[PDB]
Write a protein that binds this ligand. Sequence first.
Ligand code: QPJ
Ligand code: MG
Ligand code: MG
Ligand code: MG
Length: 326
Amino acid sequence: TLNGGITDMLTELANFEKNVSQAIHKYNAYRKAASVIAKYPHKIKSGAEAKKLPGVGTKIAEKIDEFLATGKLRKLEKIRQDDTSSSINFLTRVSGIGPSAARKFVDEGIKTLEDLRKNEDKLNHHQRIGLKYFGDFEKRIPREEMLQMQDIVLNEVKKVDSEYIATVCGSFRRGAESSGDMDVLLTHPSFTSESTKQPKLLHQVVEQLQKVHFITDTLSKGETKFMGVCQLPSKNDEKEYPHRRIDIRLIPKDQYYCGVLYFTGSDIFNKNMRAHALEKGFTINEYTIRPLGVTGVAGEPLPVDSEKDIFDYIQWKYREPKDRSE
DNA sequence: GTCGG
DNA sequence: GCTGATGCGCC
DNA sequence: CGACGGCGCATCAGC
Ligand SMILES: *CC[C@H](OP(*)(=O)O)[C@H](O)COP(=O)(O)O
Ligand SMILES: [Mg+2]
Ligand SMILES: [Mg+2]
Ligand SMILES: [Mg+2]
């Protein structure tokens, strides 16, 4: 838990700026600072010491001085006592209630868990499922359950078409001991950057996972991205496993490396790496790495035959998945 | 909130 | 219907 | 002082 006090302070400040202030760049600034301090292999003894790290400026240095002197932050003390703030911070924990919906709900007097359950007809489909599994979704998944979930998905995908490849990404591919959810990258040879030679490629997989009662609910679904809910089967007379979030992303098979880089994360690593790419005159998305032309208009996709090729282009030494976490 | 022209 | 803007989601 | 990562799906306004 080294500099755990400081990183917890910065995360709380980030969530405030995101949820209450709707200040996305302040949110990103706080999380970048939190991530760089988490990686620092010494007990920070001063704001001046922290300020030497990239992402920590004058204002974060001053808060760290306050926090090390007093073990708290008066700004955070006040946010915690503010009723609108604490109402908004609570509601934003429901899947599908963002900053705008939370403030809207608070404006209608809907501020608590009881208030939401009374007001189900005021909730869209996503929000109703977020409410139904509120408690379940705050639970982390042990790596042991992630391996059982992997076995069901990979085995069920093989049953639809042996040409599908399914890869579990997110914190699981980074080798975390627990995961917030299950992120699945899907490829099929019939879907490339050049041609969709078969329709319902994602649909057929979702349908098989519904048929064996693994996928239990849908939050959203298009041609390339599924967002839903799944659950491990339980034994005779055992308590049921919690319901879990599942994301499935179908990526063009020739663009697998850009796709697996994106879907492995972490989010903060992606933002740091894409920001660095821009500094080096390249743009990275889940599909391609492209050069920026004279104008600032992206050029043709560069050849990529490995994750490492993307690192090479922007002149970074390769980071294994396990080294891309916070 | 921070960084780099 | 379509297109473009916005909210909320993913890493 | 401008830029800050990039894009999928749901929803709604305007034509
Ligand atoms: C943490 C201190 C703040 O840094 P940012 O530009 O959010 C400001 O210095 C104080 O502003 P406040 O939020 O009005 O206290
Ligand atoms: Mg995840
Ligand atoms: Mg996910
Ligand atoms: Mg995540």
